[PDB]
Amino acid sequence: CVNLTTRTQLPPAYTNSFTRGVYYPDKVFRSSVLHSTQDLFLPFFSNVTWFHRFDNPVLPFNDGVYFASTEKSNIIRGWIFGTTLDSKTQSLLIVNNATNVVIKVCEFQFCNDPFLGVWMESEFRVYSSANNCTFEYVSQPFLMDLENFKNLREFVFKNIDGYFKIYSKHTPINLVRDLPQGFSALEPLVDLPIGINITRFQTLLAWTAGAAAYYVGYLQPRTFLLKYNENGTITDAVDCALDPLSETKCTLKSFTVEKGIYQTSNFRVQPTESIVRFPNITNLCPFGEVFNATRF
Amino acid sequence: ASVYAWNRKRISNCVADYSVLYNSASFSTFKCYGVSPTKLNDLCFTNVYADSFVIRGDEVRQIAPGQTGKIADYNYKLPDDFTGCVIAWNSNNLDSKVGGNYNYLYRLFRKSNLKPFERDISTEIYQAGSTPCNGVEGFNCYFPLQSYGFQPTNGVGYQPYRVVVLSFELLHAPATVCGPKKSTNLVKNKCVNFNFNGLTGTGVLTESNKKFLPFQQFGRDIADTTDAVRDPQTLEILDITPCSFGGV
């Protein structure tokens, strides 16, 4: 492909996650209930790394990814996931090109700077080879426009037990250089029945550079308490281990706590290291004398 | 395929008929864990996995939950909570050659026991000691893969055996692998015995336009009792209310 070196080197920034990153954990319908669940969630008020100019380096994939972007001309197209991405390990590719949404699992031959060039979209220099293809999926064709910000796109990617689950949400926004404070639920989009081993990924960007900046967060196993409204839409949630007040809310299974004293949990010191103490005897007893005997 | 490279197939969107498998006498071993074989027709399964390989006759017993051995620990491991069926039959008619069929391999040495339901394909030279192999076979450099010497003259225990294992998983997803059951038209406002994708029970069906369920298949209550379902044939939301009862 083509190597781009006109990129200023800057340390990654950070942003407050606030109350972003809550999805529907199952396919059952509940309403007017407070349900306690244990699932991989983005912690509230967490530390979210922020990138930018063209910037798309290799990013780790520990247990899940919260990918959030805000643009006005649909500059971002797709993503690449994998472990080595050099025809040695199984890799994934999602591209929402000008034609439709295409997903491939074939083992490609990736260069070090995959990107698309364009207003008409002409350059296609992401990969060179493709062999041992296993899965392929194409969505219905559609025309996608190439030209503060206006909308937010939030995506959640998790890979559990051979299933690749994707969640998404598009919402209007009046902010320019900040992550909004508020709550919004994320409906599930696609469940891919493909068992890839993912530890690394990289995003696509699209010679003139446009205004594009995205945030990345990470999900970890946390217990949450979720409030369903009359219509079954999640409108509020509580991180069960954020602070003692949230722990009290979990214990009472309610979002309102009255004045008083409550018991929440227990305190226990954890061990540091293991200790083994055995006698100093060293002589192998003869199991062979009783096992390798000619006559019983 | 070989043991270390056992093949796996996805099974979904099925009018699945298990009667032909059970009634056939061609299978020497047919053991199901967690499900009675005779009831397989009625159940509906979310997704079906099929794993196929060929092994030695002595090692068919090792394909079972909570079993230890060379092939269970190093080639194919079954979880202790496995649910599904295991099928095995003799294959001397096809996998035996007088000069020796060496197309089948199995793993001998690995660093540690593998987790259940995972595949290892690497052919790196095993390091049994301290001297690095550096990619060259020799002393302290044993190839982990060994070939079965299948011949028509082998003993009954050394005969090749073809093993196909089917695993069923059930969870909060719309079932897509069902059996051969004819669907009947539904009746509303009457205490009936419904059966929606194997979710049997009883109650009074009622048109519930109040619920929405944009993408949810089923609804439920405080206890493990369903409160609303969607008709698989035509997609609308139906409420379930139990029949009246009381003391006398």
């Epitope: 000619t294 006559r295 | 003993g155 050394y158």
Partner: antibody
């Protein structure tokens, strides 16, 4: 690593007698069985005789019954084979094999052997 | 009675070939066969006891198989020190320790 050395071979006239010995030192001799194996000059191996760990059960080959008498001495770790009434068809090579078990007629085979001693019956 | 036969008599191969030798019995012996490697210059040595059990201390190149009435010995690598005569012996019937005829193996 066990040693089995034989002696007593040579040339005798037909109808004369000769004795053989085979000394074992590399293993425990008091609880294993031993045999004698004959190899013709231009044929395959052939079993001749065998004795148990203790001299209770003794068997002989069909062609040598009534002529050969095998013995055993557990004290000096050696066995003997007295060959009597030799004919012209016993000019073969004799080995001193060791049985894997303790009996004479068992599925167990001959585990350790020794270099043969050459005998000849001619004038 | 029982009869023991050897299908092959003289074989030719190279340093990097594979050789199989078969031994056939007149009656069933139930996996009770033994294979011996007889070097022409020294004392013969046992390789395989039982149908397919390999004796300790010998290379794993030799591999035996078979049960019932027919048996077969297989060698995988043919190292150049593997020239000898091989015999198969039964230890199951009334005629004690019957030896089959020789099977000369030369490499060329």
């Amino acid at each position: 690593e066990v040693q089995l050395v034989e002696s007593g071979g040579g040339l005798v006239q037909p109808g004369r007698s000769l004795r053989l010995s085979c000394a074992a030192s590399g293993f425990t001799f008091d609880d294993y069985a031993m045999h004698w194996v004959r190899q013709a000059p231009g044929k395959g191996l052939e079993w001749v005789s065998g004795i148990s760990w203790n001299s209770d059960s003794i068997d002989y080959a069909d062609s040598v019954k009534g002529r050969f008498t095998i013995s055993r001495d557990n004290a000096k770790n050696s066995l003997y084979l007295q060959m009597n009434s030799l004919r012209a068809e016993d000019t073969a090579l004799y080995y001193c094999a060791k049985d894997r078990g303790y009996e004479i007629l068992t599925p167990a085979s001959f585990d350790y052997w020794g270099q043969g001693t050459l005998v000849t019956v001619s004038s | 009675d029982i009869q023991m036969t050897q299908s092959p008599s003289s074989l030719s191969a190279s340093v990097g070939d594979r050789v199989t030798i078969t031994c056939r019995a007149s009656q069933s012996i139930s996996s009770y066969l033994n294979w011996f490697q007889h070097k022409p210059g020294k004392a013969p040595k046992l390789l395989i006891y039982g149908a397919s059990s390999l004796q300790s201390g010998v290379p794993s190149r030799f591999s035996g198989s078979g049960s019932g009435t027919d048996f077969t010995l297989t060698i995988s690598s043919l190292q150049p020190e593997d020239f000898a005569t091989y015999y198969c012996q039964q230890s199951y019937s009334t005629p004690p320790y019957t030896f089959g005829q020789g099977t000369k193996l030369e490499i060329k």
